[PDB]
Amino acid sequence: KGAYQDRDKPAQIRFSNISAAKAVADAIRTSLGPKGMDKMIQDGKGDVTITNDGATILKQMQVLHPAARMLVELSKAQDIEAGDGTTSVVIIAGSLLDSCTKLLQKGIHPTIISESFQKALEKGIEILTDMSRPVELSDRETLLNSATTSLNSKVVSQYSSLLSPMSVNAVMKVIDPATATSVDLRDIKIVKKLGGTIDDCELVEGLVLTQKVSNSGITRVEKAKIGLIQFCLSAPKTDMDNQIVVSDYAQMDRVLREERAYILNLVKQIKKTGCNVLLIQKSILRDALSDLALHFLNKMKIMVIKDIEREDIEFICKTIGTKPVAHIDQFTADMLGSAELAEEVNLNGSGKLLKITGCASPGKTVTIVVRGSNKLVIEEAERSIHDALCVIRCLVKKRALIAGGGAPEIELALRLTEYSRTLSGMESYCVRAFADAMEVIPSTLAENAGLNPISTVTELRNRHAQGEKTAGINVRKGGISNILEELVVQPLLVSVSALTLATETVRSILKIDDVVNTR
Amino acid sequence: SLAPVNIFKAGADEERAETARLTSFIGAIAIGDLVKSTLGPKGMDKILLSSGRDASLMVTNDGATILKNIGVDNPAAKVLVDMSRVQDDEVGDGTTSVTVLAAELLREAESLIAKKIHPQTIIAGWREATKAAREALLSSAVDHGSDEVKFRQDLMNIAGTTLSSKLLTHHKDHFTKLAVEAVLRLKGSGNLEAIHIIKKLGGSLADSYLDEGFLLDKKIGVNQPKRIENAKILIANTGMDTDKIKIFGSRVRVDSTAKVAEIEHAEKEKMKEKVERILKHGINCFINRQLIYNYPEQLFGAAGVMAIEHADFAGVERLALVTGGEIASTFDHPELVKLGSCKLIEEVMIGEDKLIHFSGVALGEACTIVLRGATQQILDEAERSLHDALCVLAQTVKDSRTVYGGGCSEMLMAHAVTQLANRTPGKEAVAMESYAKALRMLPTIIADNAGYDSADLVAQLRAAHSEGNTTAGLDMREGTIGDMAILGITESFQVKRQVLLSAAEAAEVILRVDNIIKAAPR
Amino acid sequence: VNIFKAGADEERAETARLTSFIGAIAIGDLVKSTLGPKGMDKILLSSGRDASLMVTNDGATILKNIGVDNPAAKVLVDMSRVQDDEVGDGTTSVTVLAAELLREAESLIAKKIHPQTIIAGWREATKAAREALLSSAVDHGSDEVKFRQDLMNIAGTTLSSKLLTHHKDHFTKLAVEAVLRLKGSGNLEAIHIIKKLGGSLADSYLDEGFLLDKKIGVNQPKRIENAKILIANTGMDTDKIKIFGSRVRVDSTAKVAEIEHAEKEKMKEKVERILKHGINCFINRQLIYNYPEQLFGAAGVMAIEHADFAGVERLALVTGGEIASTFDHPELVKLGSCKLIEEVMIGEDKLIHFSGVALGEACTIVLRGATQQILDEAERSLHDALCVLAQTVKDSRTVYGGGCSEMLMAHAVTQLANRTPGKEAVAMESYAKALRMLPTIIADNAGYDSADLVAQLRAAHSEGNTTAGLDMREGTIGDMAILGITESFQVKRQVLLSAAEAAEVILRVDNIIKAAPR
């Protein structure tokens, strides 16, 4: 009474993929929420990291199963689009694949499951969008709450009083909240140096350099005139093959005199423009600084800095306002940046930094410097700050805000199960499985917090069934309560993108029915 | 050769009997069974996982890349793989169908040889049968093109039916027209390189779109403006980095340093003179092919004109097509070089990257498609499916003749082969009947993948085509027999003809080998 | 996660039926080349010790000698051996039919048909085919001349696919005669087949008496007229008193000399008791020692030493005596009778020739070829012919051969299929195709147009001519009633039932679990 489907290989492949996805999901399931702890990854080489970011955990943990690779790619894609929730997305994907293996055991074709999953996705997008509220920028309270919620599940939670305000200052000091619609994170330059503690992180509107000043006679310059240089301050040499022939004893003295005169002329041309500090670009094939040139510059009481990467010139120009100079005749004061102060700062014997502060033309660019005891905490602090910046980026992208702490997915689970109770047929079971497959996030939020998961989820469902929305798990109170009063929120883009990407990834995985090992 | 003397080598062997055709048939049938589970709109795609360098992983449904990536060892499997690659190169799709049909033909051939019938008889019968099938398909090949709306509806139907067997079917109603629009921007020029598919992670697959202009993944200079209105874009293929005189053996030989300083000043002077000659064109956007060093960058920034550096040959050709410019290398005559024009060249942020957006382009000859999925495998599969759709649409734009899909065309040529077989004597008739059965196996496989009663549906279609209804096929949305004219499951005539002919000829060449001789490996 | 063992594996999917089908088809293709009057036999060579070489045609020993690996091949070999034990014919036929049933089974399961559907269709088809074969069976036994002609035809059709075909006209009747000497007793051990090399295979003959491969003693005579044979199973050796724990414990040599004299005297008195029966011949089962042999030679009788259980049983059957062990009362069950006990020489050996035997209940067949392999194949195929002749003597119902019975029962299966709905009908059609694949194979091995001949037979059987089959000496469609290609009904029925049962049992496996080898 129907097709025999003799080949059981596709079913075995699907079960294997589902089991591998579930294994990857519940491997990192213990790293969710403000009570989930971070993992330590020691790769094949002598490198170790202490990470709570789901994307980095999945990248460093070199998986083997194809479904696990699909999940790590999904996590990195969610990081690209959102930047936060890269753990919840993989948890959701694994959980609902685990739910759909039972459906496969019930004799339901994979295409029907995929289409029903897509329909449940379409309903859930509407549920989440209606659940949210509009948000207006330039409101410090909501931005701070979102940044703190992003930072809470990270190692820098205890520093949230010092990192959240600077995390929102960094974003607000780059874009104009009037018409932005996006933010470019490239101009938030993160510089890391060993030493100090996390509490000494700083935000500077100026520029930070890791290079060292060539002349150790001046380090502090007040009312500095900065100027980039893209040509070489050495003996002249043409692009074509160059040779100097000497046939007299006076030729040697003459050639030395001409070299010295040319260098001194270049340095005098630089100095007569009022330049106070010099930024020399890193030039391979020609020493950008010579001993004679540096000697003359130091004699004229100037500060010289070399070995500046070609990729940083745009950042420097956007920050302090200089314009690149590739010819001496074009070097004038009309294209010479200015700053209130240039300093060479010592970090209590743990390195040296260059700080340019008080640029008279403050560009749309700030810099963050981080301090820490060991390398691992510094890297984790960088990742946490980046996640907070990405959260603010999502909030800027589309202006919508939802409650956190398990409220969105549990409310969606309800609304979707009563949606399934109106679609009687073969797809009713699949939609109900989708609805009950996202109870995993609140369950794990309750579990990692030490609460009883079953009772907590039951109370959550009951309280959202009574219309008391924005209710979720509180770890400070140690129970269940309203979340907005607890100041825990997240942008709608995070959750909506997580759900959409997870559903798309699962719908793609469910279409696999064979695996072949290529040569 | 089993003789008590061995002559070949330590490693070389010969199979000069039913062993050789046994190996060839089992290899071909193995390839066909590998491809079989990826047919029809209900087919399911496969995972290709490496066993070595970088462990490349790709999710794919089309059989061309499946047969290309895996390493076959049976020479018959090599013939099938080369068949699939050639068929993919020729038109763009039908690789799965041609491999499946050739495998089914070889299975029928082995069944025939089991009845002790000489292979040349099978070859002659198949030659006659494929002639009859060619004639039937050509006779049933409806044609459009004189009308405008009918041809565009045909294009939409062809895109939908070619994209329906891939992942993109999940958003079929959104994607097919997209593909159609792309080809409709080429104005009949069969240059698929004018289509650029930029893939970036993030966002659902429904967020893909065809831009109303061009997207370039390059960088602006330092001091250049980041936004230009009503540009006059000049596209060039000059060096303008160091500009070697290109006269090898030239060197400076001077007795003082001031001479070298003067020579280098003269070099920078000739750079400035060349940049001034370029600026004499009256332009505000300059596009190069190779790098622009710091001095020309500064000259451009002082002038106030944009400069796009290091755009490969494809980039400059696509910008010339989409904007109307002319690839230049010398600028002695500004009145002979034609300059392209756009409306806005602002920067647009997609994903986490910034791209140059030529909007309001003068000509739509070239365009770009942005693919934004959830996984790198999803991106690769989407790109491959879109490439297949574009190839088929360009082919049917070149040749507007179309035949009905869903199994109707292959059913009708199978019926023609059956009618031919019913009037021929001798052992060739059974060969023709086997050919017809192998040709009819394709809709059987489609229904099997779908999960319907394949035998009942195939018998229904056989009766429908024997009675006289030549526009009947499979309705997948419910799994019944329907009228393809109403459903509009069209297909390119050239694609079907290529599948039929290539499968027939490769089956013929494989069928007539009675000795496999392997030299010792390297 | 793997759980079984190192070396233990499981195939729980299409792989299992793939292995089973490929093994069954390998068995079928190996056995297929030995059907019909034009089939060609095979050489079996052992790669192990003694490098045994045997030239054989029947499928039973071919399948039992080779070491099969696939469990389905083991199923087929066991079925062939069991069918050889039951009747002794059609082992190749049953194996081939089972192979084609499994081939059509895999073809059907390619069309996505549940195996239990095929099982039900096959059960219905085999019920209909068995009913049709029983309805088409002709019987004799009441008649005398007609039944003898039927026996000759059965021997001919059983012996025409083997090497003795070269002299078939000579051999068939001989085999029949042997069975006609059994007088209805289902005792094939009453037939002795003595194989001696040298001379053409047409020198083989069924003796008009019995032949014994033993030796006369030293002083006994080597020829008797009007023999009075006494057949015994006594000791005639040292012949211990059997009272374990008996020993001589004396104090002089005279005592033990007296005891040994008493032993010799008791042996002499036992020989006297034997002689009191009034005999001139004596056949013993175990050895006869020197003193009884001397006494027999002095008396004037003829003694046979070490004639095993089979030998004395055959002598009792062919002569009528009883196997004596105690000679207290000679007046009880009596002796046997013959007319000559001449020693006759065959090749280089001498055998005792019992001629003019009182009863023909046992006999000997002398096989004489030019090669030991020829002798072995002649012996095996003659054994098959004798088995079939004895079976049809026990049950005289016969059905026509040459594919006629197969064609008619396949026609009945087709008619049943045409009137049954559902996916059962295609299962029965596949059953009929597999059943008709046998005469196709016979024609193929013959080398004719198999498709044309099978189409002609199908048309002739559908029309109503229910006695049409393959005439192979000319290669056309002939009448088995006129021609005389008969066959035992029991053989064909057992072939059909065993093949269908083996196909059914093999087809319904979906998981093969192999434990780690020892």
Ligand SMILES: Nc1ncnc2c1ncn2[C@@H]1O[C@H](COP(=O)(O)OP(=O)(O)O)[C@@H](O)[C@H]1O
């Ligand atoms: N203070 C808090 N109380 C309750 N739930 C929280 C709190 N902070 C974060 N969460 C929840 O933890 C979940 C996961 O957040 P997080 O672990 O920071 O990111 P990721 O999911 O990328 O690891 C969020 O869905 C959020 O609802």
Ligand SMILES: Nc1ncnc2c1ncn2[C@@H]1O[C@H](COP(=O)(O)OP(=O)(O)O)[C@@H](O)[C@H]1O
């Ligand atoms: N929606 C549909 N309904 C019926 N038949 C279809 C449909 N879509 C595709 N087909 C048929 O499936 C066949 C195989 O196409 P596809 O699976 O894309 O592989 P290929 O294009 O390589 O042959 C085509 O001949 C087409 O006629």
Ligand SMILES: Nc1ncnc2c1ncn2[C@@H]1O[C@H](COP(=O)(O)OP(=O)(O)O)[C@@H](O)[C@H]1O
């Ligand atoms: N002389 C003959 N003419 C036609 N058919 C024959 C002849 N001899 C045998 N057959 C057919 O060939 C089939 C197999 O015969 P045979 O090889 O003798 O079986 P086996 O090897 O078991 O003795 C039988 O079913 C019989 O009907």
Ligand SMILES: [Mg+2]
């Ligand atoms: Mg987070």
Ligand SMILES: [Mg+2]
């Ligand atoms: Mg296609």
Ligand SMILES: [Mg+2]
């Ligand atoms: Mg026989």
